[model samples]
Target: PIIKEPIDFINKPESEAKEWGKEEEKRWFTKLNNLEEVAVNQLKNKEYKTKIDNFSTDILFSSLTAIEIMKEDENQNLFDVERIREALLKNTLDRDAIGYVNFTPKELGINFSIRDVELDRDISDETLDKVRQQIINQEYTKFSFISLGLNDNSINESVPVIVKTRVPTTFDYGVLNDKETVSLLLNQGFSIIPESAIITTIKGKDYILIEGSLSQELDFYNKGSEAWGAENYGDYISKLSHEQLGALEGYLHSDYKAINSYLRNNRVPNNDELNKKIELISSALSVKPIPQTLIAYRRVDGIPFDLPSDFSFDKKENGEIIADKQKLNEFIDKWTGKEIENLSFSSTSLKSTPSSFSKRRFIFRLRLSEGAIGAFIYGFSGFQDEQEILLNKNSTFKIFRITPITSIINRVTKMTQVVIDAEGIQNKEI
Candidate 1:
C-alpha cells in the first residue's frame, strides 16, 4: 500500500512534472482514498493486540477472544483425521501448521479421535516419533501434548501433524496468541481442544511439566504417572508422601518467590486516593441546563450530511434523529428563498458526553480531529440562541454546552501530588 501525494500544482514542464489533467487528478485522489479505506479496515480486522499510548501511558484492549474452545466427543465425527490430512495437502491454504489427534486410552471404549489442527509450522519425523512415543507411554499431561509432522505420499507434501493431549499449549510460540482464529474454528465445528484445562503430568520426573501460577503445584502422594490421565491428573499430586512433597516444594519455592517479587508487581494500595484525584478533576467541569431553544440548519441540497457514526446524540419522539432527511427537506422547503409565506424555523438539539480517562487505570481518551472540533464548535455556538437568525440559519447547526473531563490515572502517590493549572500548566508535586 504505497500512498503517493497528489500533485498540488501544474507549474512545471511536461517532462518534469507530467502536468496532470482532471482525469489524472481524479485517479490520484481515488487511489489514495481507497488506500486509506483499506488501512482503516485492516485496523478493525486486526486479530492481535494493539496498544495505543497517550500521555506516556498505555491503554489495553482485548486482542484475544476470551471464549474457551469446546472439547470432547460431542462432535467427534465432525473431524476425520485422514480426511483432514488429505484436504490439507489439496488446499494450498492449509500448508505449514500443527494438527492434533486424540490418543485416549483404548480400554475406555472411546474409539473416536479428536483432532486439533493448529500451530503453523513444518512437520518433521523427529517430532512425529516423539508424539507417538508420548501417546503410547501416556507421557502427556491433560491438555498438554505435541505431535510430529509427516509428508503425504500421494501429495508429496510434507505436512507435520502436531498432537496434544489438551488445549493448545501456551509453551508453543504464537499458539496461545491465536485465540480469535482458534475460537472461530471451534465455532465452525472444527475439532480443536476445548476448555483450556490446566493439568500437568509427573512422568516419574523431578521437575514440574506445566506452566502455571502457584496453584498448579503437585504434592507428594499424587506423584505417580499411572493415574495421571485427563480424568485423574487433577488428583495426581495429592497421593505422594509428605517428605517427597516437602522436598518438591523446597525445590520450587525460591524460584517461585523470586518470580512473584520480580515480575507482575504487587497491586498498588492507594486506589481510593486515585479515585479522589479523578473525582476532584472531574467535578471541576461546569454543568449547565439543556437549552430551551436549540437550532440546526443545513443547505437544502442533494448532498447528505450525517452526525459521526461513533458519536452519541439525542433522538426525536419518533425514535429517530430530529433532523432526518424528510424533516430537513420539509424545513428547507418552508424556509426556502424570500418569496415564501408562513415561514417557521425549528431546531434539533443533540448532546454528546465523551467518556473521560479513569484515575485508577489507563483508558482511551476522546480525541477529535481538527475538522471535527471545528464542526462541533460551530454547532454549539449558533444553535443555542433562541431568536431565529438568517446568517447561519437554513444551515446545519447545534447548541453544545459540553464539558470534557480529562484526568491522569494513578499518576499521584502518597509522597507526591500532580496538579495542572487551568492554563494547561504542569505543576510538580508539592
Candidate 2:
C-alpha cells in the first residue's frame, strides 16, 4: 500500500493570501473535505461513524472539522481522540477546548442512559426516549413541598422546583442580589414578576411574585424559595417558615417563659406579637447575616463567566497566611501563558483593612486575542479603588467553573430539543 502523505499547503502572508481568488478558496475547501474523510475513516475502529445513525453524520463531520483545526496547530497536532475522551472522563479538559466542543454525547445522537453515564458503564438505550421525554417535561427539577396549617390549612405537593444551585463545598459567606437572582431563575424557566407588578401576599408576607406554570410551581415553597434567595430574603422561599410556624404554634400552646414575659398575666398573645417573635427567629437562621452576596463576573468577548468559589487562602504550619505560589503559577499558566520567573507577586494586604486583606489574592498577566490585557488581581474591598485591578484579563482568574454548569445547560437544551421532537411526533399523529 502506498503511504498517503498528509497534504502540504504552504503558509502565505496575509496580504498575499487575501489576493488569492475563488479558485484558490475552492481548492482549499476540497482539500479539507478529503482530509476530513481520512479522519472519519480513522475513527471507524471505535465504531463511532458506523454505530451512529445517519442523522448524526453532521456530528462526525463537525468533530472532523475541529480535529482538523487541532492538527493544523503545532501544539494540538499531538491530539488523540482517546486523550480527549480521558480528559472528558476526568473533567480536566482545557477550558478553551471545552468551549470549542461542549456538545453532549446525546446531542451527538450517541444517546445513552443518564445512569450509565453517571456510573461509567456500558448500557442500553432502552430508556433513552423515556428519559428524553422526562427531560422535556422538566421532571428532573421536581421536589416535595411540605407546609403547615397556615391560618388553619395544610399543604403538601410535589412540584418542579429550582433548588439552590450553589452547593457550598465549605463555609461560604456571600451576598445575593436581585440581578443574579433573576438571571438564575431565568435559566430554570422562571421569571420574576416585574417590579411594576404589585406584590402578592403569600403566607402573610409580601412576596415579589414569580410567573411560571402551575405544574412547574407545584412545590410552591421551592418555586418561590429558589426565585428569592432562601435565607437572604428571610424565609421568603425556604421551607423554614413552615417549621418556624409550627414552633410558633407550639410556643403559643406551651407556657414558654419568653412568650409569657411578652404577654402579661396569662393573656393570649396577639397575631402581631407572635409574628414579631417569628421574624426575630428567622433573622437568626439566615445562612449569612448579610443581605447581599459579593459576585465577581468576568466577561470574555461578551460571554459572562462567574468566578469559581473553589479557592482558599494559603497558610503555613505556624498558622500564618502566605502567598500560594503553586496555585498562583497554575492560574498564571492557565490564563496568561506565562512563567513564574517572569511574574512578581504584589501584596496589597498591608494597605487594606484586616477583613479586606489581599493576602489570598494574586496578580498575573493575560493576553487576550482582542482585549486589554495586563497585570490584574482580585480586588479586595479596601484596595478596589486604588488599582484598576478588579477587572482585567490577567486578574485573579481561572476558567469559569463550567464543567457542571455546562452539563446543566446542555441537559436543559437537550430537553428543549426533545420537546421539539415530541411536538413533531404529535403533529404527525394529528
Candidate 3:
C-alpha cells in the first residue's frame, strides 16, 4: 500500500514537463489508511492463545443432510485435513498484532470453528512500571482483573485463548512504604521463583518443577503436546504445601486427567468431522465477539498528577491559599510511613493547563529528530570505544514485569522460566 507523489517540475522529463506545464498533477492512492497500516504491522512481537468450542449440525450423523449441505456449497469440499492444516498455518497472526476476524456463519453449509478467542502476549517490564504509576497517579482505589489478549489473530482453528499476558499487580504506595506490609505478605504467603522452566534448588527442593509447574505458572505447563495445564499441579496450594507424593499425585490427577479426557471424548477423525464438531460445540456457547479487545492499557504513562493539600479540595469552600506553613509540617509528621525529605514547592501567576504538551508546538521537533539520528551514530562509536558494564547481573536473574505484557518475554523466557514476582518494584531503577 502506498501513495505516490507527483513528479517535481524541475526533475520531470523534458517532454513530459512541457506537455504537463501548469497542469493538475496526478497522485496514486492505495487502499490502506493510517489505521490499517498500523494494524498491518501491529503484531511485530506478540501472539495469542486460542480456545475454541465447535459443534456440528448432526449432518454427519445424517448422511442425507451431509450430502445436501455439501451440494449447497463447493467450498465445503475444502474441509480435507490438508486444507484445514494449511488454514491453520496460514493464520499465523501475532497475539499483539491488531487485526480482524471475518465470519460468514452457515456459509455453504459450513460453520468455521472459532470459539472463545482471546488476544494475548507476554507482559513487559516497562509496561508493568507504567501500570504501577497509573494506580498511583489515578488513585484508583478499586479495580478488577481486566481481560487481555490471547494472541494476535482472532481466528485460529476457531478458539479463544490467551497463551500469554501481562497480568496487572496494583501497589498501594502507602502500604509499600510500611515495612509491615512486606513482612506480612512474606509471612502469610509469597515465594520467589525464576520466570523460567529450568529448575533451581531453593530450600533443597526443585523450584522449577514445583513453583514453575504450579501457581500462576500453570499457564506454562504444556498439556501433553496439546494446550493447557492442571489448576493445581503439586503440593503447591495458594499459600501452603502438602507432602511430596501428594503433590505428584495431584499433578498426575489434574494434568493427566484433563488431557486423557480430552483425547477420549473430543478427538475427531478428519478435518470435515472436526469442523462439524467444532461448529456444533461453538453454537452451544454463544461466544461470538466483534473485534475483541486483544490488549488494553496494562499501564499508561504521564498520568495526571497533583500534590495533596489541605487548602486544595478539602478547604476550597472554606478559605483561600493562605500560606499555612504549620499545616505542611503537621501533615508530613502525621504521615506514618517513609520520611520523604528534600520537599520543595513554588507557585507563580503564570499558569499552564494539563494539556500544555498537546497545545504547544514542539520547539525542537526537527532538531530532536536530527539529534536522535546523531545520537545513534555516536552510540555506535561509544559502543566500540567503551567497555560494556556487566556487574552483579545474573544470567538467570534477568527481570521482567509481568504486569504489563511486552515483547521481551520470548528472549528472557527462553533463558529461564517465568517467576511471578508479586513484590512490586522494591526501588526505582538506577
Candidate 4:
C-alpha cells in the first residue's frame, strides 16, 4: 500500500526518515521484478473471473475453522456468530471507496438474525413497517439497496454473518475520475440506485414507495492479497504463476546468454567465449533453448552482412550490391518460400539497434514469424531501449517476402534497405 518514495531526507525528521528508508529497502529487496509482477497480475485476473461463477461462502467455513483452531489452543466456549460479529465489525478493509456487494444476503436467508440482539437506535413503527415492506417485494436490485449503518455503535449488530464491511467515517476523502463509469452512472444510473429498477417499478400512482433497504452484495470482488497473485510477498514459488514459470525458464536459457555476454564490457566476445557462456547457461537450465523469435530490425552501415550464409542470395550480395529495383525484387521472388540454410547465429534488434540516432544507410529488417529462433534479450539488459533478439546457432528460416525501403543519407545521398520477411523453420530438434 505504501508504494512510492521512502525517504524525505531534506525535509523530514531524522527518526521518521530512517524508519521509512529501512522499510522500503526490505520491500524492494523482496519485490518481484517488473516482468513477473505484471505477469502474475494477469494470471490472477483470469482466476478472479472464474472464481465468481462457483463462488464459495466457505469464508464462513474459514471463520468456523478460525474458532476451532483457536479453541484447540484453549477457548472457553466454541462461539459461532457472536465474537465473529464483533471481530468482523472491528476488522475492516475494502477496495472500493463506497462499497456494494456482488450478491445480496437476504435471498440466502442470512438476515444477520443472531439471538436476542436488541435494536440500539429505536425506529418509529410507521417507517419500520414500510421499510419491512421494501424487502418482501425486494427483487435485490432496487433504487438503493444500502447497507445502512445504525445511528449507534453497538457493533451495528450485523456483519461478516451478513455484512463484510460498513465504513468508518472520515479516514480519507478522494474523488474518482473514471469516465465511462460516470457516463453509465449518468445515462444509466441513479443517486444510490440503478435506473432500470427504479424506472420499471414506478407504480401507476402520482407517487410510489421510496425504499432504502441496507443489505449485502456478495463476493464478486473483495479479496485483496490473492487477487494480484503476490499473496506471499518475498516468498518464491508460492507467488509464481504458470506463465511466469515458463517465462523464467526461457529467460534463463536465451536472455541468459544475451545478457551475460555484455558483462564482459567493452571486449567483444569471440565465438568460443560466447559459446562457453551459453553452454554454462544451458547446463543450468537442463535444456538448451532456441527461442521462438519475432520480426526484428537491425541498423548498420555496410552493404552486406558477412555472416557466411550458405545461400546464393546472400553470397551474391557479398559479391555485388544491387542498384536496380528489379534485381532486388528478383532475388525476393527467387527466395520466396525457399528455406534458408547454413545461416550462422546473428544478433538483430526488436527495434533498430544502433549507435544512437545515426544516419546509417542499411536497415536489415527480418521477419521470423513463429517458433523459437532466438531468445528475447531485453530482460537483463545491462542497458535499456533496445531489444536484442539473438538468433541461435545455424538458425533456419523460410522466406516470406523481400522488398526495399529507401531513406536519405543526409544531403544528396540516399540509402536502400533490404527487407527479408521470413518465418523461422524448426528444422532441427533442440
Candidate 5:
C-alpha cells in the first residue's frame, strides 16, 4: 500500500497559506459530508454554513466531525438529550411557564410541545430556526430560559422548554447559572450574539448556544478570512492529520483551566485518559511544519494564558521569585527547565486581566524568535476574544524569567508572572 506523503507546508509565503486554506476547507467539507447524517445534512438550516461563506459547509462539517483518538468513553456527554426533548415537547397552559421566567403559552399559534415555549428572550428568527431544527433533531445542548430556576433534572423537562452549547471540562458549562462568565468572555473579546451563534448561561455555566453538538469553524487562520492576527497559518493546515486535527480541535474548544493540568505533566501513568490526548498532540505536532505554538503566536501582543495553581508571591527578582518558592515550584517545577509539549490543540488569548486569568498563577509571557504557525481558534471557540492560537503537542517554550507582579490587583492575590522570550521556538520546549 502506498501512503501519500505529507506535504511540506512550512515557512511558505502568504500565497501558499491562501492556497492551503482553500484546499483544507474543501477537505473539511468532504469530511463533514462523509460523517454527517442525512438527518443533519439536509436539515432546513444551512445558515451554519451559508452565513460563514457562500456555499461553504465548514460550520456543519465541524459539528459532525469527531476525533478518533479520544474514544467515546474518554470524553463527556454533558447534555441530557431526552430530558431536553421532553421539555420542548411538553406544554403547560394554565400552570404558567414551569421553570422559565415570564413565559406564556399562546401569544400566537406555535408548534405543539414547542408551541408553549415563550422564552423571556427571543432568539433572532435566523438563530431560532437553527435552534428549532436542533430540537427537532434532538441535538440541542442547553435549555436556556430566564430561570424560575428549573432544568432537565428539575420538573422543567416534563414541561415545554427550549436551550445553548458549552465544554464539560473547564467551567462545567452545564452546571453554571451563566452570566458573569459571558461578561468575562465579552471582556476577553468573544462575539456575544451572531447569526450562527447565541450566547447564554444555562444551569450554571455560560455557553456558546449550540445548534448541533459543539461544532466550531474549521478554517485555518489567514489574514483576510480571520481578523484576529497578522500571521497566516493556512499553509500548514494540511500538515496535520485528521485524527490529530480532531483531537487538537476538541482541545481548543476548552478553556485554559483544565488544559494546563496535562500541558506540563509529561509522565502519565499509562492508563490515564489524558495521555491519549498527549499522544495525539505529540504525533500531530511532530510533523515539524506544525511550528512552535508560543513561537508563532508571539507576533501578536497581550497574549494571555493561565496557570491553574494557588500561590501568593510577594517577593521576586529576575530568573526566580524571591519568596513562595515552594508554592510556586509546585506548578513551575513541572515545566521550569524541562522540554515539554501540550497533548492537544489548546487555547490562549491576546488579552489578560483579573477577569480572565484562571488563577493568579504565573503567566509565561512568551516572545517567539523564529517561525510562525498555529490555527487562530478565536472564532472557532465558543467564546470570542479567545484570540486563541491552536497549539500542537510538539510546540515549544522556554521559561527564561519568573517574576512577581505588584500591581494594585496583585496586592491581594500577590500574583506572579513568568517570561519566556526569544529562541525558545528553535529548541521548541520548556
Candidate 6:
C-alpha cells in the first residue's frame, strides 16, 4: 500500500488563498441547493462546518464560518444552523416569539416535555394559515381558562396554552394590536377578561396582553424556568482542547503580570510624590499591549489614564514648558516613534500661589487613533527645576514610596483563521 500526501493548495500565497476561501464560502451558502435531508453535502441548522473555503459535512463548520465571516465583510449577514442551535441553547434568541411555549403537559409529572407550537411574524394572512395548521394537527386542545397573580406560582399547575405570533396586524394584514387581540380571546370563552388580563412584554418586544387566571400563569412561569434551567451550557469551553486553553491563558497574561498585580491590589501611596512615581511606572507598562490587573489596594486613585491635563504650564519666552523641551523630545523619540513629524510645542511660566515653593508641570498629548487617547505629564518644582545636583540630594531627603500599575489588553495579530473564544453560550448581555 502506498501512502499519499494530502492536498497542499492552501500553501500558495495568502492573497490567492483568501480569494479561494471567499469564493468557496459564497458558493455553499448563497447558492444552496434544494436537495434536503442529506447531511453530507447539505447544510442544516445546528450543523457545524470544519472548513470555509471547502464545505465539508463536519459538525464544527458553523462555528468556523461564524468566527471568520464578520472579518471578511463587516456588513455581510451570516446564517448558520449550528450558530442558531447555539443561540437557542444560550437563550439569546427569543423563544416566546419563536412559537415555542415552554411547558410540561398536565399528565406528565416531568418538566422537560416540549409540545407543538404556532408562530406568526405578524398578523398577516400567513398567520391564519399557521394557526389553522396547528388546529388541523390537533396539537392544541380546548381547555378552560385559568388565571394567576403576578407573584403566584400557579402557572405550574396550568397547561401550556396557545402561543400567538408577535407580529402586529395592519389594516392590510388584518392583525390586531394587543388590546384588540385580547378582546377576541375574551369572546372565545376565555374566563380572563381583556382589561383584567395582565398586559406585559417579554424579550424586548411590543406590548402583549396575556389573558389568564393568576394561578394559571404561575404554573407557566415555574414550568418554563425549570425546563430552561437544566439545559447544558453552550458549545464553547468544551470545544477548546487543553492546548487551546493553555495558549489563551498565556496570551491573556504577559510581561507586566507580576508588577501589575503588585500595584493593583494595594492602596495608593499617601505621599503625592509616591503617587506620581506609581503613575510613571504604570504609563510605562501600559504602552505595551497586555493584561495587567493592578490590585484595588494599589490603585486608590485608580489607573491614571487621563487624555488631558487641566493645568498646562509653559515658559513665557519659549512658548514651551519651563523645562527643557528638546531633552523631553529626545526621551520620547527613543521609544514612541519618530517625534510626530512636524508637531510643535509652546510654553509659558507663572508664579505659584500661596505655596512656600511652587511646583511647575507640563502636559503633552497626541492623537493615536480615533477616540483612542495618549498623554503625559512632566515638570519640576522649586530648586528641582533649576539643578539636578539639588534634585539628586532631595531624593535622599525625602522617602517617596513607589509602585507600578499594570493594564491588561488582549491583542490579536494572526492574519489567518481565528475565533474569538468567548465564555458562556449567550453574549454577556452587555
User: Model-by-model lDDT, in order?
Assistant: 0.21, 0.24, 0.19, 0.33, 0.33, 0.21
**Candidate 6: which stretches are off by over 4 Å?**
1-35, 38-255, 262-264, 268-430
- Candidate 1 residue 423 Cα shift, in angstroms, is 64
Q: Any runs in candidate 1 off by more than 4 Å, and if so which?
A: 1-130, 135-159, 162-430
Residue lDDT tens for model 6, 289-395: 11111100000111121313322212335552243344333323332212111111111111111111111121111111111111111111222221110000001
Most lDDT-accurate candidate: 4
- List, residue by residue over 34-129, the lDDT tens digit for candidate 2: 433343234334244222222122111122323344456532212333232222222211111000101222221222233333343322344444
Worst 10 residues of 3 by lDDT: 180-189
Cα error, residue 94 of model 4, in Å, equals: 40
Model 3 TM = 0.13
**Best TM-score among the predictions, by candidate number:** 5
Worst 10 residues of 6 by lDDT: 390-399
Q: What's the C-alpha lDDT at position 17 in model 4?
A: 37
TM-score of each: 0.14, 0.15, 0.13, 0.29, 0.30, 0.17
TM-score rank order: 5, 4, 6, 2, 1, 3
lDDT of 4: 0.33
lDDT of 3: 0.19
Which of candidates 3 and 4 is the stronger one according to lDDT? 4
Candidate 2, superposed: residue stretches over 4 Å from native: 1-29, 33-37, 44-133, 137-430
Could you tell me how far off, in angstroms, the CA of residue 371 lies in candidate 5 after the best superposition?
Answer: 3.4
Please provide, for model 1 over 289-322, each residue's C-alpha lDDT reduced to its tens digit, 9 standing for 90 to 100: 1112121211111112233322221235565332
